[PDB]
Amino acid sequence: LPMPMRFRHLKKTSKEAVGVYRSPIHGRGLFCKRNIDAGEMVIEYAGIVIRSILTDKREKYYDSKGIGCYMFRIDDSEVVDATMHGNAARFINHSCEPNCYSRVINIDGQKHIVIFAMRKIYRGEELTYDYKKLPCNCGAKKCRKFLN
Ligand SMILES: Nc1ncnc2c1ncn2[C@@H]1O[C@H](CSCC[C@H](N)C(=O)O)[C@@H](O)[C@H]1O
Ligand SMILES: [Zn+2]
């Protein structure tokens, strides 16, 4: 199946597939409510695509207001700011042994960051991906110990 078809009803279906709960990794995380097949589109990392140079002053503003800052690093040039116009995907935690991965897809000329299942994921599992001095708490044995 091509990407555009799989993307069309993702907002409707995501509500049924995932939810936000307390995480043993950190704070809140994203968990699945039903088994998810390998290769399945899980959820869009919703938000505003911005040039990376802008993030430090945004984060500074958010912090000064007590607004929780949420951002997805695409690469060294671009970030998705999910602070004001994000969705449940902004709670996805990092793992040193993740079960999802991110991809930037193109829909009618526009960029969307979507999260895909790396393997079959079972009901109840936390969903995690590999983020692109803070220690890591993914709990994996093959763990890199750090976010940096
Ligand atoms: N594996 C991990 N170990 C420690 N902290 C993590 C982590 N994965 C995510 N985090 C924390 O979560 C932030 C990403 S936002 C992810 C949702 C977050 N747990 C929350 O409740 O707000 C990271 O900056 C880090 O502070
Ligand atoms: Zn870790």
PDB file of C-alpha atoms and ligand atoms in Angstrom:
ATOM      1  CA  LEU A   1       0.000   0.000   0.000  1.00  0.00           C
ATOM      2  CA  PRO A   2       1.275   3.490  -0.902  1.00  0.00           C
ATOM      3  CA  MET A   3       1.781   6.049   1.889  1.00  0.00           C
ATOM      4  CA  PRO A   4      -1.073   8.498   1.010  1.00  0.00           C
ATOM      5  CA  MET A   5      -3.765   5.832   1.476  1.00  0.00           C
ATOM      6  CA  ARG A   6      -2.294   4.630   4.772  1.00  0.00           C
ATOM      7  CA  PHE A   7      -2.174   8.254   5.979  1.00  0.00           C
ATOM      8  CA  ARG A   8      -5.723   9.365   5.145  1.00  0.00           C
ATOM      9  CA  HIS A   9      -7.573   7.979   8.184  1.00  0.00           C
ATOM     10  CA  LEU A  10      -4.629   7.901  10.606  1.00  0.00           C
ATOM     11  CA  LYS A  11      -6.166  10.489  12.964  1.00  0.00           C
ATOM     12  CA  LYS A  12      -9.356   8.435  13.294  1.00  0.00           C
ATOM     13  CA  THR A  13      -7.557   5.124  13.717  1.00  0.00           C
ATOM     14  CA  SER A  14      -4.716   6.357  15.978  1.00  0.00           C
ATOM     15  CA  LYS A  15      -7.214   7.157  18.756  1.00  0.00           C
ATOM     16  CA  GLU A  16      -8.147   3.480  18.848  1.00  0.00           C
ATOM     17  CA  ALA A  17      -4.626   2.105  18.604  1.00  0.00           C
ATOM     18  CA  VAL A  18      -2.656   4.109  21.183  1.00  0.00           C
ATOM     19  CA  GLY A  19      -3.036   6.016  24.439  1.00  0.00           C
ATOM     20  CA  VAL A  20      -0.978   8.121  26.834  1.00  0.00           C
ATOM     21  CA  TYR A  21      -0.240   6.706  30.288  1.00  0.00           C
ATOM     22  CA  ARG A  22       2.409   6.911  33.009  1.00  0.00           C
ATOM     23  CA  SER A  23       5.708   5.414  31.807  1.00  0.00           C
ATOM     24  CA  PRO A  24       8.393   3.537  33.813  1.00  0.00           C
ATOM     25  CA  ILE A  25      10.889   5.130  31.451  1.00  0.00           C
ATOM     26  CA  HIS A  26       9.988   8.761  32.171  1.00  0.00           C
ATOM     27  CA  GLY A  27       6.891  10.831  32.896  1.00  0.00           C
ATOM     28  CA  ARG A  28       4.179   9.894  30.459  1.00  0.00           C
ATOM     29  CA  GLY A  29       4.656   7.692  27.420  1.00  0.00           C
ATOM     30  CA  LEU A  30       2.713   6.355  24.448  1.00  0.00           C
ATOM     31  CA  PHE A  31       1.341   2.790  24.770  1.00  0.00           C
ATOM     32  CA  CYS A  32      -0.604   0.580  22.398  1.00  0.00           C
ATOM     33  CA  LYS A  33      -4.186  -0.468  23.196  1.00  0.00           C
ATOM     34  CA  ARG A  34      -4.240  -3.255  20.631  1.00  0.00           C
ATOM     35  CA  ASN A  35      -1.646  -5.319  18.786  1.00  0.00           C
ATOM     36  CA  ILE A  36       0.026  -3.382  15.971  1.00  0.00           C
ATOM     37  CA  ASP A  37       1.410  -5.208  12.932  1.00  0.00           C
ATOM     38  CA  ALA A  38       5.024  -4.849  11.823  1.00  0.00           C
ATOM     39  CA  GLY A  39       5.205  -2.062   9.248  1.00  0.00           C
ATOM     40  CA  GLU A  40       1.997  -0.382  10.385  1.00  0.00           C
ATOM     41  CA  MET A  41       1.635   3.422  10.518  1.00  0.00           C
ATOM     42  CA  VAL A  42       1.061   4.138  14.180  1.00  0.00           C
ATOM     43  CA  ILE A  43       0.625   7.888  14.510  1.00  0.00           C
ATOM     44  CA  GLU A  44       1.798  11.202  13.096  1.00  0.00           C
ATOM     45  CA  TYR A  45       4.174  13.311  15.157  1.00  0.00           C
ATOM     46  CA  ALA A  46       1.921  16.350  14.729  1.00  0.00           C
ATOM     47  CA  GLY A  47       3.216  19.886  14.960  1.00  0.00           C
ATOM     48  CA  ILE A  48       4.865  22.739  13.072  1.00  0.00           C
ATOM     49  CA  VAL A  49       7.977  22.110  10.978  1.00  0.00           C
ATOM     50  CA  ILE A  50      10.568  24.783  11.786  1.00  0.00           C
ATOM     51  CA  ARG A  51      14.195  25.597  11.013  1.00  0.00           C
ATOM     52  CA  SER A  52      16.453  24.210  13.759  1.00  0.00           C
ATOM     53  CA  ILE A  53      18.104  27.569  14.488  1.00  0.00           C
ATOM     54  CA  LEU A  54      14.776  28.764  15.911  1.00  0.00           C
ATOM     55  CA  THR A  55      14.402  26.109  18.618  1.00  0.00           C
ATOM     56  CA  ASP A  56      16.636  27.545  21.308  1.00  0.00           C
ATOM     57  CA  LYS A  57      14.694  30.813  21.580  1.00  0.00           C
ATOM     58  CA  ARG A  58      11.349  28.948  21.351  1.00  0.00           C
ATOM     59  CA  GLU A  59      12.364  26.585  24.135  1.00  0.00           C
ATOM     60  CA  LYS A  60      13.551  29.541  26.192  1.00  0.00           C
ATOM     61  CA  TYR A  61      10.172  31.246  25.789  1.00  0.00           C
ATOM     62  CA  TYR A  62       8.194  28.083  26.560  1.00  0.00           C
ATOM     63  CA  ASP A  63      10.315  27.417  29.650  1.00  0.00           C
ATOM     64  CA  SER A  64       9.808  30.949  30.938  1.00  0.00           C
ATOM     65  CA  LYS A  65       6.033  30.454  30.704  1.00  0.00           C
ATOM     66  CA  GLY A  66       5.986  27.007  32.308  1.00  0.00           C
ATOM     67  CA  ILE A  67       4.711  25.550  29.041  1.00  0.00           C
ATOM     68  CA  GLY A  68       6.051  22.042  28.488  1.00  0.00           C
ATOM     69  CA  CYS A  69       8.263  22.049  25.359  1.00  0.00           C
ATOM     70  CA  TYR A  70       7.959  19.127  22.917  1.00  0.00           C
ATOM     71  CA  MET A  71      10.036  18.809  19.776  1.00  0.00           C
ATOM     72  CA  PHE A  72      11.035  16.141  17.249  1.00  0.00           C
ATOM     73  CA  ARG A  73      14.461  16.511  15.683  1.00  0.00           C
ATOM     74  CA  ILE A  74      14.308  15.652  11.989  1.00  0.00           C
ATOM     75  CA  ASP A  75      17.992  16.358  11.314  1.00  0.00           C
ATOM     76  CA  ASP A  76      20.522  19.144  11.941  1.00  0.00           C
ATOM     77  CA  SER A  77      18.381  21.570   9.920  1.00  0.00           C
ATOM     78  CA  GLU A  78      14.724  20.957  10.819  1.00  0.00           C
ATOM     79  CA  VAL A  79      12.593  20.274  13.881  1.00  0.00           C
ATOM     80  CA  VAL A  80       8.886  19.631  14.510  1.00  0.00           C
ATOM     81  CA  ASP A  81       7.562  21.826  17.314  1.00  0.00           C
ATOM     82  CA  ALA A  82       4.713  19.921  19.019  1.00  0.00           C
ATOM     83  CA  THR A  83       4.446  22.318  21.963  1.00  0.00           C
ATOM     84  CA  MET A  84       1.290  24.129  20.839  1.00  0.00           C
ATOM     85  CA  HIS A  85      -0.114  22.036  17.974  1.00  0.00           C
ATOM     86  CA  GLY A  86       1.009  18.508  18.780  1.00  0.00           C
ATOM     87  CA  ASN A  87      -0.837  15.302  19.538  1.00  0.00           C
ATOM     88  CA  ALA A  88      -0.279  12.137  21.578  1.00  0.00           C
ATOM     89  CA  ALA A  89       2.920  11.298  19.663  1.00  0.00           C
ATOM     90  CA  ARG A  90       4.796  14.029  21.575  1.00  0.00           C
ATOM     91  CA  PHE A  91       4.834  11.662  24.586  1.00  0.00           C
ATOM     92  CA  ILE A  92       6.804   8.910  22.831  1.00  0.00           C
ATOM     93  CA  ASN A  93       9.932   8.125  24.874  1.00  0.00           C
ATOM     94  CA  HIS A  94      13.422   7.189  23.671  1.00  0.00           C
ATOM     95  CA  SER A  95      14.719   3.660  23.874  1.00  0.00           C
ATOM     96  CA  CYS A  96      18.149   2.177  23.281  1.00  0.00           C
ATOM     97  CA  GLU A  97      16.172  -0.840  22.005  1.00  0.00           C
ATOM     98  CA  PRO A  98      13.110   0.748  20.340  1.00  0.00           C
ATOM     99  CA  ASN A  99      10.097  -0.909  18.708  1.00  0.00           C
ATOM    100  CA  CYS A 100       9.205   1.960  16.370  1.00  0.00           C
ATOM    101  CA  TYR A 101      10.935   4.287  13.948  1.00  0.00           C
ATOM    102  CA  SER A 102      10.204   7.686  12.438  1.00  0.00           C
ATOM    103  CA  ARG A 103       9.969   8.676   8.767  1.00  0.00           C
ATOM    104  CA  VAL A 104       9.221  11.985   7.038  1.00  0.00           C
ATOM    105  CA  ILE A 105       6.590  11.333   4.369  1.00  0.00           C
ATOM    106  CA  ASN A 106       5.209  13.602   1.605  1.00  0.00           C
ATOM    107  CA  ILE A 107       1.446  14.089   1.312  1.00  0.00           C
ATOM    108  CA  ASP A 108       0.181  16.429  -1.399  1.00  0.00           C
ATOM    109  CA  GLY A 109       3.542  18.205  -1.292  1.00  0.00           C
ATOM    110  CA  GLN A 110       3.559  18.591   2.494  1.00  0.00           C
ATOM    111  CA  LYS A 111       5.861  17.054   5.136  1.00  0.00           C
ATOM    112  CA  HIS A 112       4.465  14.746   7.795  1.00  0.00           C
ATOM    113  CA  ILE A 113       6.524  12.883  10.386  1.00  0.00           C
ATOM    114  CA  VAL A 114       5.003   9.447  10.911  1.00  0.00           C
ATOM    115  CA  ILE A 115       5.826   6.706  13.387  1.00  0.00           C
ATOM    116  CA  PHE A 116       6.020   3.104  12.125  1.00  0.00           C
ATOM    117  CA  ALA A 117       6.143  -0.232  13.952  1.00  0.00           C
ATOM    118  CA  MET A 118       9.546  -2.000  13.602  1.00  0.00           C
ATOM    119  CA  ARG A 119       8.067  -5.322  14.687  1.00  0.00           C
ATOM    120  CA  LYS A 120       4.741  -6.685  15.822  1.00  0.00           C
ATOM    121  CA  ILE A 121       3.913  -4.723  18.973  1.00  0.00           C
ATOM    122  CA  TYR A 122       1.678  -6.273  21.578  1.00  0.00           C
ATOM    123  CA  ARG A 123      -1.209  -4.713  23.473  1.00  0.00           C
ATOM    124  CA  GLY A 124       0.127  -2.894  26.532  1.00  0.00           C
ATOM    125  CA  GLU A 125       3.650  -2.255  25.248  1.00  0.00           C
ATOM    126  CA  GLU A 126       5.116   1.207  25.432  1.00  0.00           C
ATOM    127  CA  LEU A 127       6.043   2.598  22.028  1.00  0.00           C
ATOM    128  CA  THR A 128       9.539   4.037  21.687  1.00  0.00           C
ATOM    129  CA  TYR A 129      11.904   5.146  18.945  1.00  0.00           C
ATOM    130  CA  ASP A 130      15.566   6.111  18.691  1.00  0.00           C
ATOM    131  CA  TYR A 131      15.888   9.876  19.147  1.00  0.00           C
ATOM    132  CA  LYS A 132      18.173  11.578  16.598  1.00  0.00           C
ATOM    133  CA  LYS A 133      24.084  15.144  30.449  1.00  0.00           C
ATOM    134  CA  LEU A 134      20.904  13.035  30.599  1.00  0.00           C
ATOM    135  CA  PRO A 135      20.939   9.262  31.372  1.00  0.00           C
ATOM    136  CA  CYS A 136      18.640   6.875  29.535  1.00  0.00           C
ATOM    137  CA  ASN A 137      16.069   4.820  31.409  1.00  0.00           C
ATOM    138  CA  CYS A 138      14.726   2.648  28.600  1.00  0.00           C
ATOM    139  CA  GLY A 139      15.471  -0.317  30.841  1.00  0.00           C
ATOM    140  CA  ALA A 140      17.077  -2.267  28.050  1.00  0.00           C
ATOM    141  CA  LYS A 141      20.027  -4.485  28.879  1.00  0.00           C
ATOM    142  CA  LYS A 142      21.795  -3.519  25.655  1.00  0.00           C
ATOM    143  CA  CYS A 143      21.408   0.084  26.782  1.00  0.00           C
ATOM    144  CA  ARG A 144      23.626   3.051  25.833  1.00  0.00           C
ATOM    145  CA  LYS A 145      23.101   4.652  29.296  1.00  0.00           C
ATOM    146  CA  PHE A 146      22.741   8.142  27.801  1.00  0.00           C
ATOM    147  CA  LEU A 147      20.483  10.343  25.714  1.00  0.00           C
ATOM    148  CA  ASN A 148      23.540  12.302  24.553  1.00  0.00           C
TER     149      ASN A 148
HETATM  150  N1  LIG B   1      14.686   6.810  27.550  1.00  0.00           N
HETATM  151  C1  LIG B   1      14.569   7.921  28.277  1.00  0.00           C
HETATM  152  N2  LIG B   1      15.256   8.048  29.451  1.00  0.00           N
HETATM  153  C2  LIG B   1      15.150   9.182  30.223  1.00  0.00           C
HETATM  154  N3  LIG B   1      14.327  10.222  29.832  1.00  0.00           N
HETATM  155  C3  LIG B   1      13.641  10.112  28.676  1.00  0.00           C
HETATM  156  C4  LIG B   1      13.742   8.975  27.887  1.00  0.00           C
HETATM  157  N4  LIG B   1      12.948   9.147  26.812  1.00  0.00           N
HETATM  158  C5  LIG B   1      12.356  10.362  26.906  1.00  0.00           C
HETATM  159  N5  LIG B   1      12.764  10.974  28.053  1.00  0.00           N
HETATM  160  C6  LIG B   1      12.379  12.311  28.531  1.00  0.00           C
HETATM  161  O1  LIG B   1      11.291  12.797  27.758  1.00  0.00           O
HETATM  162  C7  LIG B   1      11.704  13.854  26.910  1.00  0.00           C
HETATM  163  C8  LIG B   1      11.050  13.648  25.550  1.00  0.00           C
HETATM  164  S1  LIG B   1       9.272  14.051  25.564  1.00  0.00           S
HETATM  165  C9  LIG B   1       8.642  12.376  25.794  1.00  0.00           C
HETATM  166  C10 LIG B   1       7.492  12.409  26.821  1.00  0.00           C
HETATM  167  C11 LIG B   1       8.000  12.625  28.249  1.00  0.00           C
HETATM  168  N6  LIG B   1       8.262  11.340  28.901  1.00  0.00           N
HETATM  169  C12 LIG B   1       7.034  13.454  29.083  1.00  0.00           C
HETATM  170  O2  LIG B   1       6.276  12.925  29.915  1.00  0.00           O
HETATM  171  O3  LIG B   1       7.009  14.678  28.950  1.00  0.00           O
HETATM  172  C13 LIG B   1      13.229  13.810  26.899  1.00  0.00           C
HETATM  173  O4  LIG B   1      13.775  15.104  26.811  1.00  0.00           O
HETATM  174  C14 LIG B   1      13.538  13.240  28.259  1.00  0.00           C
HETATM  175  O5  LIG B   1      13.456  14.288  29.187  1.00  0.00           O
HETATM  176 ZN    ZN B   2      18.781   3.774  27.688  1.00  0.00          ZN
END
